[PDB]
């Protein structure tokens, strides 16, 4: 995750790997709070 050592971010990415902005990881994390994955957690 890049935010306010990103200089090599472009390079690591040059290998088919993805780095993320903070708005992206936040969206990702927030997606674990969606009702769907919440109930999943409640099962195991």
């Amino acid at each position: 995750t890049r935010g306010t050592n990103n200089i090599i971010a472009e390079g690591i990415e040059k290998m088919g790997v993805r780095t993320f902005s903070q708005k992206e990881m936040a969206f990702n994390l927030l997606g674990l709070l969606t009702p769907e994955v919440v109930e999943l957690c409640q099962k195991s």
Binding site: L33, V38, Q42
Partner: protein, 48 residues
């Protein structure tokens, strides 16, 4: 913590380990007692 290798682990890292693990455990444990002390058996808190 940066620039701290095995032999450098000291006061900072031990404290850091406390914030980043032991007290997180303590925190989950705390809300467990609260809920339980209130019979709250059907409203889990999700821990990311």
């Amino acid at each position: 913590e940066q620039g701290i290798e095995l032999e450098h682990i000291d006061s900072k890292s031990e404290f850091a380990h406390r914030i980043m693990l032991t007290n997180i455990l303590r925190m989950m444990g705390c809300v467990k007692k609260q809920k339980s002390a209130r019979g709250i058996e059907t409203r889990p808190a999700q821990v990311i």
